Write a protein that binds this ligand. Structure first.
Ligand SMILES: *C/C=C1/C(=C/c2[nH]c(/C=C3[NH+]=C(/C=C4\NC(=O)C(C=C)=C4C)C(C)=C\3CCC(=O)O)c(CCC(=O)O)c2C)NC(=O)[C@H]1C
Ligand SMILES: *C/C=C1/C(=C/c2[nH]c(/C=C3[NH+]=C(/C=C4\NC(=O)C(C=C)=C4C)C(C)=C\3CCC(=O)O)c(CCC(=O)O)c2C)NC(=O)[C@H]1C
Lengths: 315, 315
């Protein structure tokens, strides 16, 4: 991947189709507005950054949260959080808990660690695992790779109710082909369609080998900045590749709108450490898939990755 | 597997260590007393058999339930149940729902189909899937088969709190070896111990390739008969291999008591359709693992089966 541009907030250049592989998608300095995000020092728990919308979810102003400790804000979770994510743990490891809040439903908390920084995501949440347990029989009995792909896309559609679910396989030249598709009756088919490599550029493919699920809940929603935008530990951008709330590339969001997609989600299929493909999902309207369903999709992605490796070895 | 004896209730011979591979463990005509079981006609939903304890869980006498329809007893579930388990579906496929009941907690319903018979299990139930999602990173990063086994047993112990969790690998001669073990501090180690094939006889190993989880919740609990004991559709024994509530072999329950085990559970590890091993769990006291945790263990068993196949292929 040819070197990243600075983000727009550090004076970087505008993105065009001539340089899109240089967009620093991992450090947008902003989040999707269906949740809130805090970052905190990994030893002290001092809150270092806050999404500007944090008052809507946490009930205190961003500027008042800044500098407070997670021991003060989350006294019941802090010791567990800190034990679960020790220094040097994988940046994909998550601590999850459910918090009570004044509004309807609960608040889901998801935390991961990058270097000395803890990144906390808060999202409102008002049958999946057992449905997945059941689907494993048909995934196992699938006779070959294409049959497995067909079962996988139908299974994902059943779990999620997404309008369209595709298995998008990368060729060695990074072009893609839709090798299986489950879709709502009425929808035009992408099955068999092939696409240039530019649609999922090299830096995206690299990120997707490390952090295996990403989404855009509402393809017209404006991003919410982090404040301060730079991590004070480093005076540098905050890596958000491990946060589902990370703001999506505006170039990709424009692609999705042009395609008539209101909500998008994909899960990586990783085989021998290489990005083999994506389970790629669309909805016609905005849709926040709940955290527990996302966890189910992650698990299915891992299972599918392994089955692909096993079915491919039959050849 | 050399042919089954009739069960004791059809005049079959007593089991000894000279003939234990002939015990008809799949048709004990009885269940474990921590739940209730009904069987029903697969088209009409007519209740055909009832565990003698059914009044404790369902609030009507076994003899009064007999002949009533699932449309009458479970009006909210029957159409979904019937659609989920059509004639000829795999006998391992499950329909699951949660029912309200007068006592504390809920009643978990699990249904599967064998031939023209639906078998319904009812058990009281008052973090697992996400913990499994997390453990998949360490299972993937395990460098080889033994390391994977070590991670798997620790993971299962963390999910369940079982006193002992072993990976019990079968050799080609059906003898076993404990190749990984996670256990409570203080417990004597079985790591590296080898055991004759007789401890898990051929009919058991065969059943365990078809129905991948089984348990004994309380190794001193008396079984509860089914009434009538024979399925009226067939005038023959009711196959219970697909029911976790199935009564355990008394010979095995005696083995467990002799070993100081109060509760036992295992999950099959199946590779290329062959029984490779078991995740074998013990608790020192009785323990009913909740249905949702069992589902998580099934999912882990499938994942582990695939990882074993992939790690073994590195050789
Ligand atoms: C010049 C840059 C472009 C570009 C950049 C871009 N694309 C992504 C991410 C995705 N693009 C995807 C492509 C498809 N989805 C489809 O449905 C089809 C065809 C039917 C295609 C070809 C997909 C699946 C992704 C992954 C994300 C998702 O699942 O929604 C990114 C990275 C986005 C991010 O994670 O922030 C970027 C920077 N796309 C272009 O088309 C050109 C203009
Ligand atoms: C003559 C017959 C015998 C016999 C029969 C028998 N055994 C089983 C099932 C199991 N036996 C197991 C063996 C072990 N568990 C351990 O912890 C160790 C060693 C540390 C061993 C060797 C296991 C794991 C099972 C599976 C069930 C479970 O997980 O609890 C059956 C079938 C039981 C059923 O499903 O109804 C039978 C009939 N066992 C003997 O020792 C001899 C006397």
């Amino acid at each position: 991947p040819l070197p990243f541009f600075p983000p727009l907030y550090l004076g970087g250049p505008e993105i065009t189709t001539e340089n899109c592989e240089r967009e620093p998608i991992h450090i947008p300095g902003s989040i999707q507005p269906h949740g809130a995000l805090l970052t905190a020092d990994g030893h002290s728990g001092e809150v270092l950054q806050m999404s500007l919308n944090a008052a809507t979810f946490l009930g205190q102003e961003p500027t008042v949260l800044r500098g407070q400790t997670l021991a003060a804000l989350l006294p019941e979770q802090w010791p567990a959080l800190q034990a679960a994510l020790p220094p040097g743990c994988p940046d994909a490891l998550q601590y999850r808990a459910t918090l009570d809040w004044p509004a309807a439903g609960h608040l889901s908390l998801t935390v991961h660690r990058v270097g000395e920084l803890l990144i906390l995501e808060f999202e409102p949440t008002e049958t999946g695992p057992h449905a997945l347990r059941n689907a494993m029989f048909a995934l196992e009995s699938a006779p070959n790779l294409r049959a497995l792909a067909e079962v996988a896309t139908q299974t994902v559609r059943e779990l999620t109710g997404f309008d369209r679910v595709m298995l998008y396989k990368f060729a060695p030249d990074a072009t893609g082909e839709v090798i299986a598709e489950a879709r709502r009756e009425g929808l035009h088919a992408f099955l068999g369609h092939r696409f240039p490599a530019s649609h999922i550029p090299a830096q995206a493919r690299a990120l997707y080998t490390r952090h295996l699920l990403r989404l855009t809940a509402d393809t017209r929603a404006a991003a919410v900045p982090l404040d301060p935008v730079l991590n004070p530990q480093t005076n540098a951008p905050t890596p958000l590749g491990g946060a589902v709330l990370r703001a999506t590339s505006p170039m990709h969001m424009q692609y999705l709108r042009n395609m008539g997609v209101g909500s998008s989600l994909s899960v990586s299929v990783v085989v021998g450490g290489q990005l083999w493909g994506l389970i790629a999902c669309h909805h016609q309207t905005p849709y926040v898939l709940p955290p527990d369903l996302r966890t189910t999709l992650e698990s299915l992605g891992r299972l599918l990755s392994l089955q692909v490796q096993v079915k491919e070895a039959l050849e």
